[PDB]
Paper text:
The K307A variant (Pgp2K307A), a conserved residue within the pocket of the NTF2 domain, was also weakly associated, supporting a role for this binding pocket for appreciable PG interaction. To investigate if the loss of PG binding by the Pgp2K307A was due to conformational change, the crystal structure of this variant was solved at 1.85 Å resolution. The Pgp2K307A crystal structure contains two Pgp2K307A molecules in one asymmetric unit that superimposed with an RMSD of 0.7 Å over 281 Cα atoms. The fold of the Pgp2K307A is similar to that of wild-type Pgp2 (RMSD of 1.5 Å over 277 aligned Cα atoms). The largest deviation is located at residues 296–306 of strands β9–β10, which form a protruding lower lip of the NTF2 domain binding pocket. We conclude that β9–β10 is conformationally flexible and may allow variation in ligand specificity. In addition, we used two Pgp2 crystal structures (WT and Pgp2K307A) as initial docking conformers. The catalytic triad mutants (C174S, H157A) and three mutants within the NTF2 pocket (Y233A, K257A, and K307A) resulted in bacteria with cell curvature distributions that were similar to the Δpgp2 strain. Lower levels of products were observed in the NTF2 domain mutant strains (K257A, K307A, and E324Q) relative to the strain expressing wild-type Pgp2. Pgp2 but not the K307A mutant was pulled down by C. jejuni Δpgp2 PG sacculi, supporting a role for the pocket in PG binding.
The helical morphology of Campylobacter jejuni, a bacterium involved in host gut colonization and pathogenesis in humans, is determined by the structure of the peptidoglycan (PG) layer. Pgp2 is an LD-carboxypeptidase that cleaves D-Ala from both monomeric and cross-linked tetrapeptides. The structure of Pgp2 contains an N-terminal helix (residues Q43-I51), the catalytic LD-CPase domain (residues V65-K201), and the C-terminal NTF2 domain (residues K208-Q325), each connected to the next domain by a single loop. In summary, we show that helical shape in C. jejuni depends on both the LD-CPase and NTF2 domains of Pgp2.
Author numbering: 33 to 325
Write the structure that this text describes.
């Protein structure tokens, strides 16, 4: 219903209507964003601008140099990470090996961290100013663009909210039905949290794989939440600025990142800040949280 009755946000049909005819193939965003899409097999990096569901290709370079194939696990495996990240601002690393400037991705992200991954320093940068050769072993997992393309890259990403989407081989795209059901699940989860409905709340977490820190056990989490939720205090929780993105992976899972602003009120405790769920869609089409900020 276009009147948006109470509970609409928990309804897949509402989100399908809201997405409408938007191109959500690289995500469904509440902000204008840019998406740096790299495919490690094709050696193509593109930047797409997303404005209210209109996609425009603003940058493309073929024959890029990425790091090694396979998803990054540790510092020094030289792999370029697969997944969904963000891009920081142009900076000067102070080393001409990286070309004229560089841009830092956010590897390791929370999901990486709770999975016990290590490493860092996954940047997009250029080629050594001495003209020496690069190859997939020399970038240490970074992505190298031609130095004569970097000014245009810098211009396209400047002053924007910029995400990093790195595929291994398969072309990964979001689907309208998946985004809509994930958003329905997101607000169903919010309702369980609001109502301190512990069993429903916990059912949105992957009992097998969800972790808040390396090697956490799920009962440590469930037991803590059962205790906390037994207080049944009145809660008011608001989600906003929702940016939901397909999450390439090599686990044969359908994964998404759901980033949103969280605004939480109780009488004695309030917080607000940037939140993130890293989730899979399980075999039944249900959201299963793998990592939560």
């Amino acid at each position: 219903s276009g009147l948006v009755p109470r509970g609409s946000h928990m309804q897949k049909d509402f989100w399908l209507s809201e997405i409408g005819d938007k191109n959500i193939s690289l995500g469904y965003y509440d902000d204008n964003v840019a998406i740096v899409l790299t495919n490690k097999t094709d050696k193509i990096l593109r930047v797409y601008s997303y404005e209210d569901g209109k996609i425009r290709k603003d940058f493309e370079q073929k024959e890029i140099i990425t790091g090694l194939m396979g998803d990054k696990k540790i510092e020094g495996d030289l792999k370029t990470p697969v997944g969904f990240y963000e891009l920081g601002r142009k900076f000067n690393p102070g080393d001409p090996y990286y070309g004229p400037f560089a841009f830092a991705t956010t590897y390791p992200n929370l999901l990486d961290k709770v999975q016990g991954k290590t490493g860092g320093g996954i940047w997009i940068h250029g080629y050594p100013l001495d003209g020496s050769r690069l190859d997939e072993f020399k970038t240490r997992g970074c992505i190298a663009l031609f130095n004569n393309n970097l000014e245009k890259f810098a211009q396209v990403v400047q002053d924007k909210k910029v995400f990093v989407m790195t595929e291994e081989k398969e072309k990964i795209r979001a689907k309208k039905d998946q985004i809509a059901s994930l958003l329905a699940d997101l607000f169903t989860w919010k309702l369980a949290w609001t109502n301190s409905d512990t069993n429903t709340y916990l059912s949105f977490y992957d009992e097998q794989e969800f972790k808040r820190f390396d090697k956490m056990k799920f009962e440590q989490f469930a037991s803590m939440k059962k205790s906390i939720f037994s207080r049944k205090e009145d809660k008011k929780i608001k989600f906003s600025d929702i940016n939901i993105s397909p999450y390439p992976n090599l686990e044969n899972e359908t994964m998404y990142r759901i980033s949103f602003y969280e605004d939480y009120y109780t009488k004695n405790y309030q917080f607000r800040g940037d939140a993130i769920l890293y989730v899979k869609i399980d075999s039944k089409g249900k959201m299963k949280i793998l990592a939560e900020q």
